[PDB]
Amino acid sequence: ATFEIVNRCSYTVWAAASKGDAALDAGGRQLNSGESWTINVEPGTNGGKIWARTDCYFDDSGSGICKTGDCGGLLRCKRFGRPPTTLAEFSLNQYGKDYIDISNIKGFNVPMNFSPTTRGCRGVRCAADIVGQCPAKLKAPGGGCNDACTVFQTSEYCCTTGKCGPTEYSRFFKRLCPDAFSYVLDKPTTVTCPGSSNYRVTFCPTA
């Protein structure tokens, strides 16, 4: 499956793609404002994620650091990124269908639209100014808006016991972005697409 990653932000971002235990395609690449990078993800990929990283510095070997979404200091991500990270999530060819969603469970750093480039389903989007409107206690000094689990580490925010409800903090993310997961047990906003669909992830879509 192809995923065209487009950066419509006025600032550079370093795209990242991983399934947690391995990189997807090259795993990561710099995207200056306006640039597009197309990656290929193997069919059957379960639990894949794509996200943006901001304010990164990498050396010749591809090692360094990013203020948001850093994945073990690597340009080419092999693992998931450090919150806050707006997440485009997908599981492909799961019993004949693809499943996509956007999640704010790990916080928000950059606005995003995640849509299919093929027929059969609609896209999802979270493009509100969550960083600008972020509640004081969730603001990440390093940049972005942290999720409450990251900030407070409680069973309720982290939904560790599998028994949790919405919170004042999750409601903030849900209010700004109704179409993205605001907490672990949020009412699903996952879209079912035809198996083997292709997609486009756009950072700063309303730009």
Swiss-Prot record:
Organism superkingdom: Eukaryota
Gene3D superfamilies from the UniProt entry: Thaumatin (2.60.110.10)
An example Gene Ontology CC term for this record: cytoplasmic vesicle
Alphabetized UniProt keyword annotations: Cytoplasmic vesicle, Disulfide bond, Signal, Taste-modifying protein
Cystine crosslinks: C9-C204, C56-C66, C71-C77, C121-C193, C126-C177, C134-C145, C149-C158, C159-C164
CDD domains: TLP-P
Subcellular location field: Cytoplasmic vesicle
Primary location group: cytoplasm
Entry function: Taste-modifying protein; intensely sweet-tasting. It is 100000 times sweeter than sucrose on a molar basis.
Family recorded in the similarity comment: Belongs to the thaumatin family.
Listed PANTHER family: OS03G0233200 PROTEIN
Name of this protein: Thaumatin I
Originating species: Thaumatococcus daniellii (Katemfe)
